[PDB]
Amino acid sequence: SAHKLFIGGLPNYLNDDQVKELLTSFGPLKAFNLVKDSATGLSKGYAFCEYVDINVTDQAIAGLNGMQLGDKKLLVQRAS
């Protein structure tokens, strides 16, 4: 859907609350998950989210795509 994003490249030590805080700085979320290895529990650095508002979605992909977080760079797209 047009409100949904697929994010990769997050530093693997960031937790759900920290990733969620970065995302909600753009506007409110209606869904979120941070992808984890089922056996180790460690983050894979991917996240999926859905914003309430389409305009926020558009600004979030523009703002997050290419964002540098230390030695990592986010790659973000709409979740077609």
Q: Residue 36 is which amino acid? A: K
What does the alpha-carbon distance between residue 17 and residue 15 come to, in Å, rounded to a whole number?
Answer: 6
> Any idea what the Cα angle at residue 76 is, between residues 74 and 80, rounded to 5°?
160
Other CB atoms within a 10 A radius of the CB of residue 20 amount to 17
Of the candidates 29, 34, 73, the residue with the CA atom closest to the CA atom of residue 53: 29
Domain boundaries, the chain: 1-80
Fold classification of 1-80 (topology level): Alpha-Beta Plaits (3.30.70)
Cβ 69 vs Cβ 8: under 8 Å? no
Cβ pair 70, 61 in contact under 8 A = no
Helix (H, G, I), strand (E, B) or coil at 26: coil
